[PDB]
Ligand SMILES: NC(=O)c1ccc[n+]([C@@H]2O[C@H](COP(=O)([O-])OP(=O)(O)OC[C@H]3O[C@@H](n4cnc5c(N)ncnc54)[C@H](O)[C@@H]3O)[C@@H](O)[C@H]2O)c1
């Protein structure tokens with residue numbers, strides 16, 4: 001059973017991703033994390049921890065002390081949210097990745113990081129997430145795993161969270177590449193690991 | 207007449223470019239800079255300064271105190287050494303770059319950064335060099351101008367004299383004549399947009415390459 005740390009956990013996806021993995025590997029094996037304050041219920045779901053991504057030593061303390069093997073990395077400044085504060089966006093996305101790759105490469109941690117489908121600091125850092133992530137796989141052993149999320153509710157949320165769960169369960173031997181395109185409504189994604197979008201146009205209305 | 211700051215100048219290109227521009231714009235108009243001790247002659251060639259690219263504050267000072275209008279960013283860890291020192295290479299190529307962009311965009315500087323023709327953190331940062339600089343051209347008015355250097359012959363290739371001249375030319379150009387910020391630049395093999403837009407013509411094809419090299 002793996003030990004999870006979800007970075008940027010209080011976002012749209014992170015909370016759901018958490019409660020999926022919790023009912024899988026157990027309550028105490030998924031550690032949720034953010035810089036913002038957790039609502040009443042999401043706190044009590046399971047171990048929540050303040051974790052600043054720009055603070056490199058925070059991550060290490062946590063990954064050592066809490067014996068982390070799997071790390072999901074959702075913390076990022078959104079496109080428009082970061083276009084007003086570029087320095088911040090650039091730091092949080094690119095420096096944050098750098099700190100995340102180092103912690104994971106050093107302490108032998110499976111690293112999930114989502115990408116997307118550049119005129120925008122968010123987009124530039126997603127290209128950079130892919131290329132850097134692929135480099136740390138070659139240069140060190142880093143078990144880096146990434147899949148380009150499209151639009152999420154294009155695709156439904158329950159497909160998006162389960163796509164993330166499956167690609168981490170799978171063996172590294174059956175992954176021809178480290179960055180995957182995941183599409184609902186992507187052959188390699190469907191071939192290497194059994195990917196199938198459940199929610200398509202009609203049953204998405206239900 | 208612009209005032210030039212070269213960055214990482216004590217490399218291969220840096221001294222050549224420095225010596226080229228000092229003949230063009232004047233000696234004390236071109237400040238050369240690096241974090242190494244410059245040889246006796248290059249130090250006296252004209253204004254030399256310690257410029258660490260990992261100190262943002264240091265750059266601002268330099269840029270303001272000398273009214274730097276043009277900046278040539280040559281400070282880098284080329285993959286060879288950077289592949290061992292990933293941490294140090296990452297910082298210098300990426301965070302270093304960031305600092306250059308910011309200083310440039312702030313004090314309204316014309317910024318030259320060279321790229322190359324990705325499984326090495328050097329290469330990954332050169333992709334980054336390009337996608338940022340162009341973003342910074344749209345997000346702010348940053349006059350960012352990038353050539354993609356090929357194999358650079360000295361003593362898909364190119365003799366050093368072309369490399370340097372091409373860089374002077376792409377910076378002298380009217381912003382009006384540039385359809386794009388990153389331009390391919392080619393000589394020989396053994397760059398349509400560059401020739402099309404700002405009149406790039408390489409004077410050192412092969413015959414004269416061999417001619418010069420033998421001296
Ligand atoms: N929302 C979508 O539909 C969508 C679409 C495409 C891609 N994605 C990708 O999915 C990922 C997660 O999506 P989401 O909706 O959960 O994110 P979100 O935008 O809802 O939340 C982002 C989180 O990042 C955190 N954060 C910001 N700076 C931080 C720092 N320095 N340290 C730690 N945390 C910090 C915030 O507190 C926040 O909880 C994103 O990285 C994004 O690239 C999402």
Ligand SMILES: NC(=O)c1ccc[n+]([C@@H]2O[C@H](COP(=O)([O-])OP(=O)(O)OC[C@H]3O[C@@H](n4cnc5c(N)ncnc54)[C@H](O)[C@@H]3O)[C@@H](O)[C@H]2O)c1
Pocket residue numbers: 213214215216217218219220240241242257258259260279280281282283284298302320321322323355356357358
């Ligand atoms: N000549 C080529 O083969 C070639 C090919 C393609 C691209 N390029 C590009 O041209 C540029 C210059 O090439 P070069 O031949 O001078 O390389 P070089 O290795 O000779 O010079 C790099 C310089 O960067 C300096 N430097 C290192 N860390 C620094 C820091 N923190 N602050 C300031 N300076 C620092 C070093 O002192 C060194 O003098 C590079 O950016 C490279 O991307 C060169």
